[model samples]
Target: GKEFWNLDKNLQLRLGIVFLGAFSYGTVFSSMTIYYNQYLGSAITGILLALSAVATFVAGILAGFFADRNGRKPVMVFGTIIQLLGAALAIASNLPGHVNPWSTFIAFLLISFGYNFVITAGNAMIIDASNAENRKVVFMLDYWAQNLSVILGAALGAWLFRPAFEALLVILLLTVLVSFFLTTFVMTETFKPTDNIFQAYKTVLQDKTYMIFMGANIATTFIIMQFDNFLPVHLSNSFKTITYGQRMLTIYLILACVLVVLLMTTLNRLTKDWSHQKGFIWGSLFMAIGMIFSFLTTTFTPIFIAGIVYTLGEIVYTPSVQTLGADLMNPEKIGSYNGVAAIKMPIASILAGLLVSISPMIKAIGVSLVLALTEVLAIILVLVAVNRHQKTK
Candidate 1:
């Protein structure tokens, strides 16, 4: 295993920025979806998310371009400022007697913008700091940090939801400010600050292997992003009897936290020696299986099982895909490739939001068919990429 302990101080600083930014962002996001849906109805919430996705998608590509051309520091600073403003707006929206749909929408839009900036900059920064040998570990560590932060944030936020929404937003705001300060003060420029962003984009396109891998990753994201977006609604509609009108937000938080910890402590350890592609195959298998299982029942047992399986797949596949992308890209080109590659998740989220908004006809069976096909396709693509790389080597 590559040791981060011996890495330079600058690398450590950059890693800290990545982890903190993730934590701050995750804390807000974990609660926001449910908050919007509960207060505004699922349809409106989905529409808000769709709009947010549009903002994020455009920002993602632009951030990548800017990071490649203008350097990482300025862009990170810009992202941090956006997040702070978003937090402030959200907190204001929640102030006594002032809450309204327009305020909430503004809050979400700013949050969407802020989050995308951090994501694009953070992804590019990690590639700049890490080499091929340690990129997997770095990505895993970052994911672990994100999960940990979400757990803490969710616990505190859930406990305080009975209070004014302003109070919760304030806490979120403070965390975002801390993250912003950390990035602005502690992190240095990773990119050269004068590279040709257009050239970097062009280079990424010219690489065939990178293009295929990116396409497959995007498709996989599209297929799976819906589950996260719709699962809450599905459970709310189907499990009303079991929960007895109790809010199931806590269940989701607990489920996510437990699954992440279990993976970090157990399944991840078990798969330490598997090739990245093998892990993806198994991950896709688990994801497809989980989606299928969820379609069969609205019961707690089946839902719980699906959660466990899907989280397992997430733990396995996420780091593998990110690490593989880092492996295949050069430092100079990583920002553009990674940025371009990230559009898949947002696109999928947007599609999911749209589907959930306009159609009350979404059936679990339909979701199952879509996810099952996607998983099979993802497995096949990964297998092909793996074999081709091996043959060439």
Candidate 2:
């Protein structure tokens, strides 16, 4: 408890800023698909969303390289400014009754690109400021801050989605501006690259263990992507109304956040001695079980149960995965390593968006099954990698 409270000043500031940005992100982006689908039709909305993922995919790779080569603070500030502009565009898109879908699409592209930049740098910043003894706690803190922000934003978004979308955009813009000011003025740069950026990336690319981990991570991310892309739409369709669907989704997110807040620190401490590989396996199993329950149910009660299960898996899985990357990577190339790891989310998003575009119900079930099997596959790969790594050690 005291340890978490006594984090480095820079780390604390960064975490505070991240909470603000995440609040803005969750408030606007969480309900974006529903907003887009109402104005732009599901197919076009999916395509636009996939294109945003494409922006993030490319930006992630570049952001890592840039953060390492340049510095984390500048890149972070620049990214936030870009996001602020994106929020402005979003506000414009929702003007009166004549909504401009293309404006909204462009807004998604800008925000996704900027968001990836901030996240890649922010993650590396955590590694720079933390060591083995406290890294898991640091990550858990970051995760907690994010989910807490999501709870605030998602609740507000659900309430405002029908009544005052423009007001939501204005609030998002203000929050991003606050995040930007804090990052630029208060946060210190945490990394500096000495080697050729390209050469550093080349070395990162050569790490076979990291590469395998990335491949497995992509599979898991694809399923996670469904939470935002498909689950809302699926529920909306199932409930026969967006209002009711959003209400249920809000409840699920609220429950998920509450569980994370209550359990993450305790779980992280309990598992402090476990290898990252063990965490991955157990977390994956939890998520797989959760997904199964989610797909089988149409009602709010079972879905809420599923959310708790999956959120537990997320709490266990995420920090372990990040810490594992920190363990496997060269200190000088952590940003690059993280950047490569970050690719999974966008790539998964692209695929998930496309898959759901075809048929939400069938594709949702197919994705769930694939997610379960893939997590099992990830466990096998982690086991093999860990064994080989130990033999060398």
Candidate 3:
């Protein structure tokens, strides 16, 4: 507790960036998955999600390199500007019933570019402000911020969607602007890009530990992205569940935020001594178990139970994994390692988004099964990685 509160002013700002970034785009993307599908057709929605993931993956790599060379602040500024432009285009595309597909794709690309850059650069900034010993706490705080932002944003989106899209976009645009301004004034550069990309890439490749963790991370992403992408369809169709209106997207968002808050006030005290790797092993297993519950249930009750369990697991897992990454990385090379690590989930997200859109004919059960299997594999892989790390220590 003392270690966490003892963090300096810059550290707090670095942590807040996570919330700001998530708040800026979380509502849009979470709601967009359903919105584009319902309004624009599943094909267009899939293409747009895939395109966004591609942009994000590329931006992660380039941002790392860019941050290293030009500095984190500049990359973030560029990204924030792109995000504002993307948001404007997104609003425009949704408003005109006869919007062009290419215009929508361009908007996705810009948004993806901006969001990914913030993720990589912002995480690196946070890591820069922390030492390995307290890094996991810092990361958990970041995750808490993200979950809170998602909950609020999704709740707002859902409640406001009925009134009008114009009002929604105006509010989202303001948050985006705030995020950009914060990064410009409050954040500091964490890495120097004078180092060669090839050299940095090679170093990560050589670390079997990083590779192992990355493997687990990718597998986890493959599973979770499915829930984010397809659950709304399932709830709306088979379960005939109401999502708080467009606010139905609020389901996972609220679950996450509520759990994060609960954990912050309660579980943080309980898990104080558990190492990051231990948290991952336990968290991953519980999350996989939660997915199994969801797969078996066709009713809302079971679904809610599954959501609670999974959210708790996330409370444990996300920060642990991030902190573990911070432990493994060189302080000066945080940007490169983070950028390298960040690609795992985006690649999985792209594939998952495509599948959710293209295979609209597929049963929701099939999607849930696939997600469960991915989580299982991820859990096993992370356990193996954790064992190897223990041996070395």
Candidate 4:
């Protein structure tokens, strides 16, 4: 495994800027939903959030093609500048006695779109900058590093979001301003123009194995989104303890953080030995079993007992997915491929929302069955894709 500090200077600088950018978003986004629900009502907030998903969906396609054509730094810098605009608008909305919901919605919409642009370009740049072996670590490092900001920002938002959103916006604005300058001056051009956007997109769409793999990812993401949707509600409704759902979530989180800190080195070595097939399929399998066990069971004992395995599966599954996605990419069209991959989340978000909406009809066990079947589908699709790729190779 490569040390973070030993990575190329360009990679290091871009990562630092990413950390700063995410930190700013963290201050607002962690509690943005709660704030919106209170300020604008849940139905409107949900609609607005859905609109933001569309924003990211559009961002992924547009920014990715542009990055594939023009290079990464320009796309990234453009995103940072958009983020600056978003932060500025949000700050203005939060000004003394000048609050406006539409303005705030527009502001957050810009922020989401801008962040997605940066992500599409930035991720392509990461694949550009790092080797296959070290690339997943780079992602894991960024995940955890950015996670710290989420924790810090969530804490701050919980405390100050209602009382002083303007202050949070000010902090967010400052961080984004720094990200813009860093992106402009410090970020390197990692992508070289390869194909025209039409040809590039065609190549991506025609990759049969990749498309199936993407289908699996969409399903898997939908499965993951349960925690954000009905899963917590299910837990709270079923459990005797009022805090049972949140408590389980908190413990699972702590357990995951601890496991990542402790097992990162061991898993790095393990993944080195394991094929992408073994890691992704088996990891998904483990995750599926754990989730089925947890979600289907009624008792609190089973929830955490099974959840421990679920969390373990998460650590194993996530890095495998990252590295495997890299293996599937054609470096010449990395940006296009990344953009396509980015489409999975918004799809999943919509699917999960639909699942939540229909939960009253589906009921608990049926909902579990849907997620379980989706997991099975994901594993099979991944297997077929990986097998096909290996056979063709």
Candidate 5:
């Protein structure tokens, strides 16, 4: 009970908003692939998602930059309003007369951008609330919290999304609206960023160590994006069972949850002795092996085994990167750093977009090559970044 209030008040509001945001969750996810596949084709889907990726890329940079120059509260509040509008548009586009694909795409794009803006601001706020001593655990905890919220939304989707899709969209709008009030009127600011926009970003660019750090993180993000891209198509083709791909994906997610629950205490114990870098190295290595192992395997049983391992790697790998990202930020420019770090997802999304279409043509050999080599590239970049960190210290 006492520990409940240990997190910063600002973080409490910010963290809570993530759950609120997830309220709009699984409707989009339920038929992300076509539902639109007949209307849009796989290539068009890739472009559509990629377009949103680029759109958020722009939004994230602006959100981060302005968040620093302005304040976290207003940025998040504005994001919430836009999300409300996006949800409204989303609901309208799905109705009887309004069921055009282009309208739906526009809504998706707007929702995507709005969500990213809130997330970017919320992330920067986490940095404001955290310190060197508690940063790792704080970041780690946030990861799990956000993950749980998404799962919560997914759980709700089973009933709401199937029966009343429009209802959930309205619910999400209400939730988003509520988050704005929670932040706007209730939550107080912890810190704010101030700078000349271009001048501020230039300083961030000049820092090579930070760039290297971001490189490691960016590459790792690209690795995980495979879950949505190559992993599915690869599994779908490998298994003859109808919708076996979805089954394995479900198993992967379940295993991930289980491993986190069972091993989190063990992880906490190990973190006491191992530096964050040590943890990340092993985590990244295991991640590569498990994913690569899955790529090579054909049978469902072995694929489950591979899923368990990769899921474990992911459990460890995720928080370490989040913590390290904060640790590397220049105190004066954490806001700008937040903007730059936002690039990781968009960059990964773009690469993943390419794979969405290309994986079909590449088949197993090419997917295997891409997966294996990318992990190595990510791992090497981290080592390089870690080396630089050592020198700087």
Candidate 6:
């Protein structure tokens, strides 16, 4: 793999901006749930969060169309400014003993919409700037960098969540401002207009192969969201220790991040020759097995072991899926395709929340079954798609 620093200057700058924006996003959003739950109550907080998801879903589609039609740079810069404005509003609402839940909710809604815009534009920009041979590595670097930023942001958020809530918001605002400036001053436009924006989306929708692949992707995203939604609760409810279950879960996440940081490139290179279908099949198998093992186990040690196994699967499947999506997409329609692809995340998140609202044990067993079965279904779909693709060739 080429050293990331050896990449073009623009690529380096874009990636840096991505890292900064991700960190800011992680920090603010991670703590916001707790912040709102404390002030506005869990019900209101949940509604606000749902609104944010809706904002993301709507903005993602529009951003893709506009980014492709207008330009990547302008859309990105506009998104960043919106994010900055949102963060500032959040900061204003954090005033001591005068918390404004409505303001915070609106702020987060803007942030959510802005985030999708940036992501759609950024993904398209990266594809525009990099060639096929190097794109996988570029995507892998992005995956690794974003995870690293999340780790940093989560830690910082945890630390500042109670003692320095206002300070945290200020820091988040600064981060977004920096990201905005970096994008505006440093990143160049990457939109190569082709067909009409509506026609581009029509093309994407008409691609049966891509649509089947997207179905599998959505199912896989739901499976992943189970881990986020129910895993910690299951551990806490099942284990006897006061904080031990949560602590162990934290360790699980940290280990996954560390492993990705250390070995993502090495693993990607090792599997470079494998077809995306093959990668997804094997990766999903590992993930399903690991999830089952972790959820069923009562002991601490086995949980850690299972986590490592799952993390390997995660690392393998993620880039493979992303690369496959990019490869199948029309070059000129990248932003729109990405926008469509991104719709799954919020949908999955909402579904996972509903699933976890049931008893934890029920949630665990149910989602675990779904996770395993979903992967199996994904494997079958991919096999059929790949076979048809080959036959066409």
lDDT of each: 0.70, 0.78, 0.71, 0.77, 0.74, 0.78
Off by over 4 Å in 6: 195-200, 242-244, 350-367, 390-393
Error of 4 at 387 (Å): 2.0
Query: Which runs in model 3 stand beyond 4 Å of their true positions?
Result: 1-6, 33-39, 88-105, 193-199, 229-253, 346-380, 387-393
Q: lDDT tens digits, residues 128-184, model 1? A: 877767677777777776777667666666676656567667766776777687778
Clashing pairs in 1: none
lDDT of 6 by residue, 2-74 (tens): 6697787667877787788778766677777777877787888878777777778888888888877888988
TM-score of 2: 0.84
Better of 4 and 5 by TM-score: 4
lDDT of each residue in 95-179, candidate 3, tens digit only: 6556555675677678778878877777777776677677777777777777778777677777766566656666667777777
Candidate 4 stretches with Cα past 4 Å from truth are: 195-199, 242-272, 357-362
How large an RMSD does model 6 have? Answer: 2.6
Q: Return the TM-score for each candidate structure.
A: 0.83, 0.84, 0.81, 0.90, 0.88, 0.91
Q: After superposition, how far is residue 241 of candidate 1 from its true place, in Å?
A: 3.3
Provide the lDDT at 79 for model 1.
Answer: 82
lDDT at residue 145 of model 4 (Cα atoms) = 64
Q: Write the per-residue lDDT of candidate 4 for residues 269-297, one digit (tens) a residue.
A: 66666776677766677667676776677
Judged by whole-model lDDT over C-alpha atoms, candidate 2 comes out at: 0.78
What is the per-residue lDDT of model 2 for residues 1-393, given as tens digits with 9 covering 90 to 100? 466678987788768877887787777787778778887879888787777777787788888888888888888888998898898998888798878878887986887788788888888888898888878778778888888888887778778877888898888788778778788888888887765767868888898877777776776666677777777777777743323876777677677788988898778778879888878777777877786677667876778778888888888988887777677777888778877886677677777778677755465567567667767787777776666556655
How many steric overlaps does candidate 3 have?
5
Candidate 3 has a TM-score of 0.81
* Model 2 misplaced stretches (Cα beyond 4 Å): 89-101, 195-200, 226-251, 296-306, 347-372, 391-393
- lDDT at 229, model 3: 59
List of clashing residue pairs for candidate 4: none
